[PDB]
Design a protein around this ligand. Structure first.
Ligand SMILES: *[C@@H]1O[C@H](CO)[C@@H](O[C@@H]2O[C@H](CO)[C@@H](O)[C@H](O)[C@H]2NC(C)=O)[C@H](O)[C@H]1NC(C)=O
Ligand SMILES: *[C@@H]1O[C@H](CO[C@@H]2O[C@@H](C)[C@@H](O)[C@@H](O)[C@@H]2O)[C@@H](O)[C@H](O)[C@H]1NC(C)=O
Ligand SMILES: *[C@@H]1O[C@H](CO)[C@@H](O)[C@H](O)[C@H]1NC(C)=O
Ligand SMILES: *[C@@H]1O[C@H](CO)[C@@H](O)[C@H](O)[C@H]1NC(C)=O
Ligand SMILES: *[C@@H]1O[C@H](CO)[C@@H](O)[C@H](O)[C@H]1NC(C)=O
Ligand SMILES: *[C@@H]1O[C@H](CO)[C@@H](O)[C@H](O)[C@H]1NC(C)=O
Ligand SMILES: OC[C@H]1O[C@@H](O)[C@@H](O)[C@@H](O)[C@@H]1O
Lengths: 120, 411, 108, 109
């Protein structure tokens, strides 16, 4: 049993920030890197960025600004994604999935944390 | 439970990039000579060729030449191996010489028909003759032509060249199109090269003409040889010879165009003046341009006039095949074998290196061990970057292949 | 800037083989993967390496890639294949690109 | 099996016996070096060696020609050295000569 579990639903006002955890259970955090994907409500999968568990070097991400920030604590074996100044567009279900076979596929996915950018 | 061989792909994650002096790498394993071997690994389907000869290992009697394709599978104990299921031998060994590329369900191997002998040795004796031999990657009973084919092209669009021929072991498949490395026997009169391009500076014993005269087999040779890529549109048999551009202009030596990290990477043996290993990714393939790695560390053995570590323009025709792969892009770490001797083919070592540094090395054999042709291929097997190299270790002479695991920890 | 164009809607009666094709520039060499996610569930990998099937999966899925297209074929559509199918490939130059997802409508 | 004594390309060398050159008597699988201190040196067959009048093996600040008597060589021309055979390394270069000072090498391997 290998899975990436995150926190529950979060309701965040515009311009705020939310910390979405990504726990790892049943498998060694060191071996396989973690990958970030968000699903907009009613749209398809989109790859946010790739993070390295061992090196922890500057984690690669798809083309945009530096709003998203990646970090990890190997002692607790979790990956974090800081979203400073959340925008209404930056809403949906965010999953963390591991790069099980490098550039082949994502083996194990996350249950997702429905981050909601609600004005009211 | 069995890891699948795939093209080296994906982000590196763990990787070593800082120099380590420890021995962490591990090579993992009469009267007849075997030379001019061939190894080409793409997506788990390798090819092995050779030129079996009697007695003399440079001018001996060509006993047979064998071309076959097998599949790259795990040994059953997670160590990569090389397994073969298809073999094939031409009728007359002498004609077929200097022979591959992967396209789905097939494996095209462009060869040269040479009754006189090696076209480099006596070029006018050779008439332009090209034959492509394909072997089905998986044997199929009652196949017919699909299992084995023998096609000689009626024409080749050479251009300025009067004859071209396959010259490198392994090729690439930019989509449906096929590509085979090739050399061009362009006439010595037709070739043009500006002397100022040759960097006579930093060396006082050199002369401007050395870059041009080194290009040919000798200073009086009939034809300059330029390495290149020979294409074939598999869907449509017109072959148009694509040749390397003017940068780092050197002798056409055997060439391995290969795809690492989903991009073409080209190697060229240091037969001419630069004894230093020239390598790099290919910006464009249909027009040829390779960004040569600025590798100011590793070289090849050479004769007294261009020995190892030489950087001076001199007229020399000698060298050994010492190719390398690309373990990673951002670190540009390259895995290859280079012989440790100034003017002798002795002491090969598997080297994982960089532009201006070497990470770590391992002695393949003794310092006095003789080895000249060294082919190296790196494939990825379940998130760990591997490398398979075939080398003629000598004190029966036969190239043998051994695999090395690349360590991702600098510790 | 890499794209994996995939048709939006695919309609198929039960028992008929359904074909979904991903169009990408030079998809022959880029290894591909296929993900299905029924509504309100996390995506599950079904076909990768253009031929291989992950462990503990039904054998009715099969993939093939040639030229600028990779295709996943189902040997008859049951009641569980009613989902949105997603394909992806890894590109060195840009990123882990993802497809646009296809809608698989199955009658009954 | 060991690196033989290097033969300098200097006229002052006394190991070059007059009228017959210097006989080396190497063995298959041996290493040998020749150092230059204005000479061009070539390896030829019997008749040319007997006449010895006019790719070079040497072109002459430290120029050394290392030669190993095993077939695996960086010489792309594939010139080999077979056991029980014989080769003649000579130079026909004066200051700017084969018979003048017995500038001969007998490759009796
Ligand atoms: C190699 O062959 C392919 C097809 O066999 C050629 O691809 C064609 O390119 C033209 C260019 O406008 C398109 O209009 C066609 O639709 C393409 N055909 C296919 C089947 O996609 C390709 O051009 C050929 N190579 C060269 C260098 O011309
Ligand atoms: C190999 O040669 C090394 C020196 O390189 C030589 O001199 C420079 C100036 C260039 O001309 C280069 O082409 C020459 O090969 C030595 O430092 C080294 O010790 C030699 N190898 C061994 C085993 O002694
Ligand atoms: C050398 O050239 C001649 C013709 O000029 C040819 O007959 C002979 O076969 C050539 N030698 C070799 C080794 O091909
Ligand atoms: C060769 O390069 C030099 C260097 O500038 C240039 O002056 C000369 O015109 C060039 N020769 C030709 C024929 O282009
Ligand atoms: C090597 O250095 C030269 C010097 O300008 C440069 O033109 C070239 O781009 C460099 N090559 C690489 C691969 O960095
Ligand atoms: C050397 O020999 C050549 C023979 O062509 C002759 O022209 C030259 O004058 C000679 N030089 C000396 C110094 O003996
Ligand atoms: O290239 C390295 C070499 O540089 C010069 C030689 O005199 C040596 O000092 C050294 O081995």
């Amino acid at each position: 049993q290998v899975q990436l579990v995150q926190s529950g639903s979060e309701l965040k006002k515009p311009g705020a920030s939310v910390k979405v955890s990504c726990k790892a259970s049943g498998y060694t955090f060191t071996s396989y890197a973690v990958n970030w994907v968000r699903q907009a409500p009613g749209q398809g999968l989109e790859w946010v960025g790739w993070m390295s568990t061992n090196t922890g070097d500057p984690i690669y991400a798809q083309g945009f600004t530096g709003r998203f920030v990646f970090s990890l604590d190997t002692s607790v074996s979790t990956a974090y994604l800081q979203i400073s100044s959340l925008k209404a567009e930056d809403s949906g279900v965010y999953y963390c999935a591991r790069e099980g076979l490098r550039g082949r596929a994502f083996d194990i996915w996350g249950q997702g944390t429905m981050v909601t950018v609600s004005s009211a | 439970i069995s890891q699948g061989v795939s093209d080296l792909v994906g982000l590196p994650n763990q990787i070593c990039l800082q120099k380590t002096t420890s021995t962490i790498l591990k090579p993992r394993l009469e009267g007849v000579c075997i030379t001019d071997p061939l190894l080409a690994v793409d997506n788990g389907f390798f090819a092995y060729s050779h030129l079996e000869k009697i007695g003399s290992c440079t001018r001996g009697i060509a006993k047979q030449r064998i071309i076959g394709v097998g599949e790259v599978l795990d040994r059953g104990d997670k160590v990569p191996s090389m397994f073969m299921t298809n073999v094939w031998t031409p009728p007359n060994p002498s004609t077929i010489h200097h022979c591959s590329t992967y396209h789905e369900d097939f494996y095209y191997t462009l060869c040269a028909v040479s009754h006189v002998g090696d076209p480099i040795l006596n070029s006018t004796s050779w008439t332009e003759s090209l034959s492509l031999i394909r072997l089905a990657v998986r044997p199929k009973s009652d196949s017919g032509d699909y299992n084995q084919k023998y096609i000689a092209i009626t024409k080749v669009e050479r251009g300025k060249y009067d004859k071209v021929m396959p010259y490198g072991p392994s090729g690439i498949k930019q989509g449906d199109t096929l590509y085979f490395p090739a050399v061009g026997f362009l006439p010595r009169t037709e070739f043009q090269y500006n002397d100022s391009n040759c960097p006579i500076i930093h060396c006082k014993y050199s002369k401007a003409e050395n870059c041009r005269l080194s290009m040919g087999v000798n200073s009086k040779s009939h034809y300059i040889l330029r390495s290149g890529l020979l294409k074939y549109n598999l869907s449509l048999i017109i072959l148009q010879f694509i040749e390397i551009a003017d940068n780092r202009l050197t002798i056409g030596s055997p060439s391995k165009i290969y795809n690492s990290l989903g991009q073409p990477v080209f190697y060229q043996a240091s037969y001419s003046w630069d004894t230093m290993i020239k390598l790099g990714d290919v910006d464009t393939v249909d027009p040829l341009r390779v960004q040569w790695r600025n590798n100011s560390v590793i070289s090849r053995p050479g004769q007294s006039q261009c020995p190892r570590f030489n950087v001076c323009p001199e007229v020399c025709w000698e060298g050994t095949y010492n190719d390398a792969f690309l373990i990673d892009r951002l670190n540009w770490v390259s895995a290859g074998v280079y012989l440790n001797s100034n003017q002798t083919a002795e002491n090969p070592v598997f080297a994982v290196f960089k532009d201006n540094e070497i990470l770590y090395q391992v002695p393949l054999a003794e310092d006095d061990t003789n080895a000249q042709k060294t082919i190296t291929d790196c494939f990825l097997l379940e998130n760990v970057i591997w490398c398979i190299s075939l080398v003629e270790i000598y004190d029966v002479i036969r190239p043998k292949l051994f695999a090395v695991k690349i360590p991702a920890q600098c510790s | 800037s890499y794209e994996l164009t995939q048709p939006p809607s695919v309609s198929v009666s039960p028992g008929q083989t359904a074909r979904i094709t991903c169009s990408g520039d030079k998809l022959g060499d880029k290894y591909a993967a296929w993900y299905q996610q029924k509504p309100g569930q996390s995506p599950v990998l079904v076909i990768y390496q253009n031929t291989k099937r992950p462990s503990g999966i039904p054998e009715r899925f099969s993939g093939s890639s040639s030229g600028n297209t990779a295709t996943l074929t189902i040997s008859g559509t049951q009641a569980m294949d009613e989902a949105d199918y997603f394909c992806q490939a890894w590109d060195s130059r840009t990123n882990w690109v993802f497809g646009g997802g296809t809608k698989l409508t199955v009658l009954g | 099996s060991i690196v033989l004594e290097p033969i300098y390309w200097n006229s002052s060398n006394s190991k070059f016996l007059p009228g017959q050159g210097l006989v080396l008597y190497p063995q298959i699988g041996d290493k040998l070096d020749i150092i230059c201190p204005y000479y061009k040196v070539y390896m030829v067959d019997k008749d040319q060696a007997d006449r010895c009048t006019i790719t070079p093996l040497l072109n002459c600040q430290d120029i050394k020609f290392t030669i190993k008597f095993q077939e695996f060589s960086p010489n792309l021309w594939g010139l080999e050295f077979q056991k029980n055979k014989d080769y003649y390394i000579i130079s026909t270069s004066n200051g700017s000569v084969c018979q003048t000072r017995a500038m001969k090498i007998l490759m009796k391997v």
